[PDB]
Amino acid sequence: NECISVKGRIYSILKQIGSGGSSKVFQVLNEKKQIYAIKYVNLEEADNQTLDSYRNEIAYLNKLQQHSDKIIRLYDYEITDQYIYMVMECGNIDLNSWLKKKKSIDPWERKSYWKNMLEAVHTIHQHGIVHSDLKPANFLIVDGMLKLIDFGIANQMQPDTTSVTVNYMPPEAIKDMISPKSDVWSLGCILYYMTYGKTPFQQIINQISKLHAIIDPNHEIEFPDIPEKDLQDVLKCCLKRDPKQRISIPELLAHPYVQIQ
Ligand SMILES: COc1cc(N2CCCC2=O)ccc1Nc1nc(NC2CCOCC2)c2c(C#N)c[nH]c2n1
Ligand SMILES: [Mg+2]
Ligand SMILES: [Mg+2]
Numbered sequence: 737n738e739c740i741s742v743k744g745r746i747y748s749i750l751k752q753i754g755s756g757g758s759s760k761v762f763q764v765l766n767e768k769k770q771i772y773a774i775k776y777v778n779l780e781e782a783d784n785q786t787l788d789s790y791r792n793e794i795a796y797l798n799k800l801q802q803h804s805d806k807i808i809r810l811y812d813y814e815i816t817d818q819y820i821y822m823v824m825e826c827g828n829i830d831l832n833s834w835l836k837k838k839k840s841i842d843p844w845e846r847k848s849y850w851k852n853m854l855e856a857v858h859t860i861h862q863h864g865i866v867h868s869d870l871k872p873a874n875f876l877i878v879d880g881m882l883k884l885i886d887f888g889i890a891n892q893m894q895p896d897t898t899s900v901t902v903n904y905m906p907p908e909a910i911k912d913m914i915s916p917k918s919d920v921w922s923l924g925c926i927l928y929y930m931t932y933g934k935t936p937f938q939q940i941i942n943q944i945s946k947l948h949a950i951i952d953p954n955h956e957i958e959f960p961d962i963p964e965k966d967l968q969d970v971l972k973c974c975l976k977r978d979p980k981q982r983i984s985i986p987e988l989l990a991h992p993y994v995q996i997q
Contacts, residue, residue, distance in 0.1 A: 750764060794820075811825070832871065852881050853875060871901075906979075928974075937949045
């Protein structure tokens with residue numbers, strides 16, 4: 737019967753979904769035995785860089801959810817000098833965990849998840865954010881939909897277990913040692929994974945030349961023919977290494993793959 741109070745109301749902790757650095761996310765019930773997610777950040781030690789990333793996340797989450805229901809909802813929050821509590825709509829599960837168990841995706845459901853992710857990413861681009869590190873873990877499944885959680889700022893957390901990648905990074909991020917085009921690359925890797933059941937360079941299991949493969953022009957990604965050729969076309973347009981020739985989000989929204997059927 738571990739509990740959390742937040743701006744008046746009490747919540748029972750059903751379990752800890754995940755953790756990350758100084759954060760924790762709990763699946764909880766309110767007094768009306770309704771389910772929610774609560775994120776907790778122990779601010780006790782945390783530099784002004786960490787503090788500000790979390791303050792920025794909360795502001796954008798509060799702003800953005802008026803413009804799109806593909807952004808996870810922030811219902812209430814409590815913030816002091818010691819801690820943060822955020823009450824949010826709780827997802828059934830994150831998309832990474834969900835992919836890693838499913839055999840094969842229903843084609844109409846892949847198309848629908850795809851529209852969901854485009855809308856969400858589109859929404860954050862309109863308000864001046866480039867995620868830059870998109871991956872399946874950033875999307876939750878709720879009400880048969882995909883909703884975005886992470887904005888790039890704030891430290892990513894990891895699902896917890898009761899025991900004890902880089903496949904999505906855009907090429908121009910590797911050569912950065914970054915624009916809305918970088919999120920379309922990462923979205924194409926997810927859709928590609930949803931189509932061919934595998935990430936473009938998911939087999940180059942050694943990292944340094946996984947990276948090398950990604951930035952290498954005369955390394956070619958394979959697009960086996962498939963029934964839905966509009967989907968073959970989406971993937972080929974997303975996965976162009978040259979950012980300036982890569983398809984954009986506004987264009988992807990006008991594409992037959994999302995507009996027909
Ligand atoms: C039942 O609930 C869930 C369960 C699971 N998993 C993962 C595998 C095993 C399992 O059962 C994953 C997500 C949810 N639902 C959920 N998860 C959130 N954070 C997770 C933090 C760890 O990495 C993935 C996301 C938030 C969030 C934030 N921040 C605001 N709402 C949220 N809803
Ligand atoms: Mg068990
Ligand atoms: Mg295990």
